[PDB]
Design an enzyme around this catalytic site. Structure first.
Site, short mmCIF file in Angstrom:
data_model
loop_
_atom_site.label_atom_id
_atom_site.label_comp_id
_atom_site.label_asym_id
_atom_site.label_seq_id
_atom_site.Cartn_x
_atom_site.Cartn_y
_atom_site.Cartn_z
N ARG C 26 0.79 -1.23 0.00
CA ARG C 26 0.00 0.00 0.00
C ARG C 26 0.82 1.28 0.00
O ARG C 26 0.86 2.01 -0.99
CB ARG C 26 -0.94 0.03 1.20
CG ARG C 26 -1.97 1.13 1.13
CD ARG C 26 -3.37 0.53 1.21
NE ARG C 26 -3.93 0.65 2.55
CZ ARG C 26 -5.03 0.03 2.97
NH1 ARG C 26 -5.69 -0.78 2.16
NH2 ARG C 26 -5.45 0.21 4.21
N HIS C 72 -7.14 -2.97 -8.96
CA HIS C 72 -7.15 -2.35 -7.64
C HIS C 72 -8.51 -2.39 -7.01
O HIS C 72 -9.35 -1.56 -7.33
CB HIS C 72 -6.76 -0.90 -7.75
CG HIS C 72 -6.24 -0.32 -6.47
ND1 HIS C 72 -5.21 -0.90 -5.77
CD2 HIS C 72 -6.60 0.78 -5.78
CE1 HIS C 72 -4.96 -0.18 -4.70
NE2 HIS C 72 -5.78 0.85 -4.68
N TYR C 116 -15.45 14.88 -14.93
CA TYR C 116 -15.14 16.01 -15.80
C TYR C 116 -13.82 15.86 -16.56
O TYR C 116 -13.69 16.28 -17.71
CB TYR C 116 -15.06 17.29 -14.99
CG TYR C 116 -16.36 17.71 -14.35
CD1 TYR C 116 -17.42 18.17 -15.13
CD2 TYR C 116 -16.52 17.67 -12.97
CE1 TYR C 116 -18.61 18.56 -14.55
CE2 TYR C 116 -17.71 18.07 -12.39
CZ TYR C 116 -18.74 18.53 -13.19
OH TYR C 116 -19.93 18.89 -12.63
N1 LIG Z 1 -26.96 23.87 -3.79
C1 LIG Z 1 -27.33 22.46 -3.76
C2 LIG Z 1 -27.21 21.89 -2.38
C3 LIG Z 1 -26.30 20.71 -2.48
N2 LIG Z 1 -26.38 20.25 -3.84
C4 LIG Z 1 -26.27 19.02 -4.61
C5 LIG Z 1 -26.94 17.93 -4.11
F1 LIG Z 1 -27.65 18.05 -2.99
C6 LIG Z 1 -26.89 16.71 -4.76
C7 LIG Z 1 -26.16 16.53 -5.94
C8 LIG Z 1 -26.16 15.24 -6.55
O1 LIG Z 1 -26.75 14.25 -6.14
C9 LIG Z 1 -25.45 15.08 -7.71
C10 LIG Z 1 -25.35 13.72 -8.47
O2 LIG Z 1 -24.26 13.50 -9.10
O3 LIG Z 1 -26.30 12.89 -8.41
C11 LIG Z 1 -24.76 16.13 -8.25
N3 LIG Z 1 -24.74 17.36 -7.67
C12 LIG Z 1 -24.00 18.36 -8.42
C13 LIG Z 1 -23.95 18.88 -9.83
C14 LIG Z 1 -24.79 19.58 -8.84
C15 LIG Z 1 -25.46 17.63 -6.50
C16 LIG Z 1 -25.52 18.90 -5.79
C17 LIG Z 1 -24.83 20.18 -6.19
O4 LIG Z 1 -24.30 20.93 -5.17
C18 LIG Z 1 -25.07 22.02 -4.87
C19 LIG Z 1 -26.46 21.56 -4.60
#
Ligand SMILES: N[C@@H]1CCN2c3c(F)cc4c(=O)c(C(=O)O)cn(C5CC5)c4c3COC[C@H]12
Ligand SMILES: N[C@@H]1CCN2c3c(F)cc4c(=O)c(C(=O)O)cn(C5CC5)c4c3COC[C@H]12
Ligand SMILES: [Mg+2]
Ligand SMILES: [Mg+2]
Ligand SMILES: [Mg+2]
Ligand SMILES: [Mg+2]
Ligand SMILES: [Mg+2]
Ligand SMILES: [Mg+2]
Lengths: 482, 208, 482, 210
Positions: C26, C72, C116
């Site tokens: 590790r 892994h 990304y």
């Molecule tokens: N302002 C919002 C409160 C917290 N939140 C989320 C989230 F709760 C879930 C998710 C997800 O479940 C989620 C996923 O991949 O399923 C992705 N995001 C981000 C792209 C917005 C989320 C985000 C983004 O952050 C900001 C918002």
DNA sequence: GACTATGCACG
DNA sequence: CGTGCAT
DNA sequence: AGTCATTCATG
DNA sequence: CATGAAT
């Protein structure tokens, strides 16, 4: 260095872009395979990767990431979440993905993270993909422009009705409940013999929805309205036994609940009645479900009107609810509110294009090989002369003009012959070839018939729909009433 | 955090300390709710030898764990006023699984000594293979394979059958054989002093 | 149903179990290729996948999931975070991974999420994997027992020193700083020619660490101590110029900082000096770094003792830090504290193992063919009779047997001969074949020499090392002083 | 949340409203820290045509936009007391990027009408391609004579972003001007309003599914 | 590794 | 209020 | 999609 | 207190 734009002439362009996309390519199913694109990609991808019911499970993260880099350019989590649902047997009537490990529950609690779970296509999904290797379906380029993907799957059963959909876009949304696989096939098959079939007749085969969650469905009337217009309001009520307990106390026991309903909340919301004394006589609520069976005991006090309690719960909780049909789907690229007939018709339509496409593919294969075999049969009777002729040629190409000119083989035959491995000259047996040539002529005959006679093709399509029904048929789960 | 047993019963009730929210989840599902509670351990348990008794009490998994057992910590500890006949540490059959068992065990030896010496602290042995086998020697005899990489890939009905069923489960009981040989053993592996540990490792770990 | 063990005996099997794993597998680098198993898995996977410096970037999620399912068996995050680090040009002296997108900064804001970014192996990374496909390194089974994976890479350059390692385990830890590719290679080449070389002499070629963040390394004596015993405490100090400002004021301008130091936190901790006024004379702190330059201006006040301030910041901030060598690595499955010498020694020994292995491989290939080619050259002398023997044989098997018994061909040639395509019979040119027979005999003599002559071998090894240096060599960044 | 510009100055300072934290961070690196501020729009932005002004003032993005532009909101909105001379919406060039632009715009219109009416609200056109750079599939096919197909902002390194979209002397830039004031209230209300039927019909009348 | 807020349409 | 693909 | 805590050794 | 592969 800067160009200007109207607010109108902008929201127009912008929202129109997002409107179109989120309708055609996100939130609504294709009317033929019953899939939203993220679902179709998951399936196509896992299949390409050989990740099928008959082979080992793949770590989910591997499946997902391959999806996300080959076909679906979006959140890994969205992809995983989708994949997880297709595997939950209390949301899909006929699950498309099998998954080892914590994949959620009816209590709504969250599945294990994508790094812990393993998964693979269910045997049923295989039929959704059947024949895809055979040029039976229109392919498009992927976001990369590196790989083709299918725009719709062959669907050897009618997924849209069987597994349902749901369903929120822009200007349109969709809710389609799941249906007993065998019934839907029975309907499709009748309609194949009887294009102009009225809803009433179809309903003798396809009487209503069959929820994986089971329970009691009420409203023949609205079911017709739904199967006719795409919209309708039916009632779903929980299945409920009544057990006697020692001491003159009775117990309401729930064994099945309504589709799309969270068992855990339901249980609280009921105990919530008891706590608030909203209805007289509840002793205690208890979720007694365990790994092999759902069970909610609502034990009541002595001298308590058990019919009063049950009725109140049905009305003021989700022990009974309204399901609303809102059957929307994508037909010729457009959203389309649709009932039983536009559906089955579109399915049949599609099953047609596929069987036709498949049957050309196979014919053409068989033709080409028949051609080679015809050549190999002649070769045998002139083996020596052929060897001699090759020996006498200066190189590969020349050997072919020579095989042609001297024996009227075709290019394709000459090539086959000239690329035969030496040891093949010990396999000088005409009668096995003559047996294949026959196998082959028959195959070509059968396929040509399919291609040139609509009836012959539809009977194929029925032989097959039935085979699927015999193989995957299972009993109704939801009872009906009116 | 805690998913509790349905009925409160010191004589029967069991406390399952699962390594992971994920497995914590398969446990809630596969368990028998009438007498089996579930408490996930989300992340590596603190070391209760190395850290300060200040930061030790401000620890989430240490709080909810002293509080979910209802006997309190230290020498203010009443084993009679407990909450469970058994306490079960259930981890992946992996290295880090091992490490976790190792940290939990020092916490109970250090701050609930009665519980271990009273034989109330156990460790669940999940299966390594799938009949089911726990040893590579129990498998090759079963050849007359799915290889479990952790609890997370096991299904609820399976988990119950193999490691949660009080009638089908293999279950290790922790005992203190030589109290004073257990203070050294523990203080060397888990203590603040590095050099003694290295030597221990050097003398006992066979790198081959 | 239930069996008991000692506390003394349970902590034993548990901590020994874990310790062994976290040490061997590790936290600590193999002494020869410089990699901890996660990094190795990362490079071997991406490579198997053709995700190389010369080909389009892949979505990180695709790579990561493939690592996770093949090699892994752990966090997708851990794996990513590792991947991201091997791509940060301010942590690695020579980055092994090229990543498109936000992968962090010296300000230590987090990299974009796995969903990304894209990535591929760097060109130099390939050199770590050079010749892996020639059975040059021992492979083991993955966790699955479904796929083999390399236990160490071929390391065409000496990664351990070049890139460094850190370094926390159980009973041990490791901190090895990065070094100049050219300097390290110069040292290794000297040791190749002079096995018993003393540190003092190796340090003429490899005078110290070369941080990718550059700056000033102070302590020639401790560098020696460290290269000798593998432990040693050196000083790293920031590169500072001083600018006069139109007012009788002065400005301290930082341009390089200490390895592993967070630029954003430094700037803050300095402004804290200004804000608390622990030291008199700071007027403003300005991070003035842009996408192509590092620059922090510390504007002082008029009449403000700039020696005094600079000294204070060197002491009470990370503007200057101590760096501690703790060179531990894995030699023979064992954690081992090592200085410059066993490191270069182990490297050299490894490159020998590889070059030997690689030459046996290429040789075995050349031979297998040269053998075939001999057979073919014969067949032509007796073409007519060989065709007749096949013609007379009963099947591949029988034909091979006849060629062996009637003409002393061996299996391998009898296979080759019997599986030749008919068109080959056209040819009778024995020359071209003969030309290949020569080229092959020469290649084998060359490779046999390598294997049989320790010096020929070592010469090759030097030759290769030098090519690597000519190709990837780059100037020092960190200056040395004592 | 917000990354401020190193020197206060309503005359030059720009505010970048970036789709998402990943790209917000790339922008944090590619910017010119002297006059460019970054404010990540983490997630999809609240529809201020549908939601109740209560739930609106309680939404963290809207609050931390209004309170970093330093001019309050609504009818108590002094344009003269703003902080930036250019507010730049910078979203991926995907559909959901387009969706965000839709939502942010409806907000300024609705609760900061003076800010757009004065031409202070811009929209960054990131590059769609790299072989140099091209924006239109037409601007592309001309380069192949003289392809990395950017799927979003998060796929670009900082020196790339700055040169193509953030650098004031190299960026293409849209200016949102209002031409027909009464014909916007309707275009906005149809598309972002609470009533659903009109919007369904507008989609049927303008979107060609072909 | 679970948590948090939005859009969108529909009772 | 909750649904499910999206950010 | 960022965020939170813990192990382990070292100065 | 921060380091980097692990839970
Ligand atoms: N302002 C919002 C409160 C917290 N939140 C989320 C989230 F709760 C879930 C998710 C997800 O479940 C989620 C996923 O991949 O399923 C992705 N995001 C981000 C792209 C917005 C989320 C985000 C983004 O952050 C900001 C918002
Ligand atoms: N009790 C702790 C507070 C929050 N926290 C984390 C965390 F902060 C990060 C992480 C991670 O970064 C992380 C990763 O994969 O990189 C994984 N985990 C979970 C397995 C523990 C984390 C956990 C576990 O949850 C509980 C602990
Ligand atoms: Mg989500
Ligand atoms: Mg109700
Ligand atoms: Mg594990
Ligand atoms: Mg982490
Ligand atoms: Mg200092
Ligand atoms: Mg996007």
């Amino acid at each position: 260095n800067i160009q200007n734009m109207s607010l109108e002439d902008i929201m127009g362009e912008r929202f129109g872009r997002y409107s179109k996309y989120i309708i055609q390519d996100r939130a609504l199913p294709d009317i033929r395979d019953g899939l939203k694109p993220v679902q179709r990609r998951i399936l196509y991808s896992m299949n390409k990767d050989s990740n099928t019911f008959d082979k080992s499970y793949r770590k989910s993260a591997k499946s997902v990431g391959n999806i996300m880099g080959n076909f679906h350019p979006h959140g890994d989590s969205s992809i995983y979440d989708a994949m997880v649902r297709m595997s939950q047997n209390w949301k899909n009537r006929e699950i498309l993905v099998e998954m080892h490990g914590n994949n959620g529950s009816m209590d709504g609690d969250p599945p294990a993270a994508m790094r812990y779970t393993e998964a693979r296509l269910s045997e049923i999904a295989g039929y959704l993909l059947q024949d895809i290797e055979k040029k039976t379906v229109p392919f498009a380029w992927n976001f990369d422009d590196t790989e083709k993907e299918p725009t719709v799957l062959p669907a050897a059963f009618p997924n849209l009705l069987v597994n349902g959909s749901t369903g929120i876009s822009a200007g349109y949304a969709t809710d389609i409940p799941p249906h007993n696989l065998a019934e839907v096939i029975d309907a499709a098959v009748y309609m194949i013999d009887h294009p102009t079939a009225k809803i009433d007749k179809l309903m003798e085969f396809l009487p209503g929805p069959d929820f994986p969650t089971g329970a009691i469905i009420q409203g023949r009337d609205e079911i017709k309205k739904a199967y006719e217009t795409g919209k309708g309001r039916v009632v779903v009520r929980s299945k409920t036994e009544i057990e006697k307990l020692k001491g003159g106390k009775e117990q309401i026991v729930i064994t099945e609940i309504p589709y799309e309903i969270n068992k855990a909340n339901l249980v609280k919301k009921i105990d919530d009645v008891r706590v608030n004394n909203k209805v007289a006589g509840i002793a205690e609520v208890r979720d007694e479900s365990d790994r092999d069976g759902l069970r909610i005991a609502i034990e009541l006090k002595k001298d308590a009107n058990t019919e009063l309690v049950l009725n109140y719960l049905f009305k003021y909780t989700d022990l009974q609810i309204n399901y609303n049909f809102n059957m929307v789907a994508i037909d010729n690229f457009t959203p389309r509110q649709v009932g039983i007939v536009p559906i089955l018709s579109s399915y049949i339509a599609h099953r047609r294009e596929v069987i036709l496409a498949r049957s050309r593919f196979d014919k053409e294969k068989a033709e080409k090989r028949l051609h080679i075999v015809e050549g190999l049969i002649r070769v045998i009777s002139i083996l020596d002369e052929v060897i001699a002729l090759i020996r006498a040629s200066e190189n590969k190409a020349d050997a072919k003009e020579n095989l042609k000119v001297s024996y009227d083989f075709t290019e394709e035959q000459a090539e086959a012959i000239v690329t035969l491995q030496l040891y093949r000259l010990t396999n000088t047996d005409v009668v096995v070839l003559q047996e294949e040539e026959a196998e082959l002529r028959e195959k070509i005959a059968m396929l040509a018939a399919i291609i040139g006679d609509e009836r012959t093709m539809y009977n194929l399509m029925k032989k097959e729909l039935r085979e699927v029904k015999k193989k995957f048929a299972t009993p109704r789960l939801s009872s009906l009433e009116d | 955090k805690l998913t509790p047993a349905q009925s409160k019963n010191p004589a029967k009730n069991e406390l399952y300390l699962v390594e992971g929210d994920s497995a914590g989840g398969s446990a809630k599902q596969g368990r028998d709710r009438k007498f089996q509670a579930i408490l996930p351990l989300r992340g590596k348990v603190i070391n209760t030898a190395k850290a300060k008794m200040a930061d030790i009490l401000k620890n989430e998994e240490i709080n909810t764990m002293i509080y979910t057992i209802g006997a309190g910590v230290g020498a203010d500890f009443s084993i009679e006023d407990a909450n469970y006949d058994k306490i079960i540490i259930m981890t992946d059959a992996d290295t880090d699984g091992a490490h976790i068992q190792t940290l939990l065990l020092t916490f109970f030896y250090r701050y609930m000594r009665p519980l271990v010496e009273a034989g109330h602290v156990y460790i669940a042995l999940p299966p390594l293979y799938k009949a089911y086998a726990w040893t590579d020697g129990e498998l090759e005899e079963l050849r007359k394979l799915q290889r479990y990489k952790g609890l997370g890939e096991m299904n609820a009905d399976q988990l119950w059958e193999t490691t949660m069923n009080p009638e089908t489960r293999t279950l290790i009981r922790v005992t203190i054989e030589d109290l004073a040989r257990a203070e050294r053993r523990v203080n060397v592996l888990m203590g603040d002093k590095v050099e003694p540990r290295r030597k221990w490792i050097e003398d006992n770990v066979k790198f081959t």
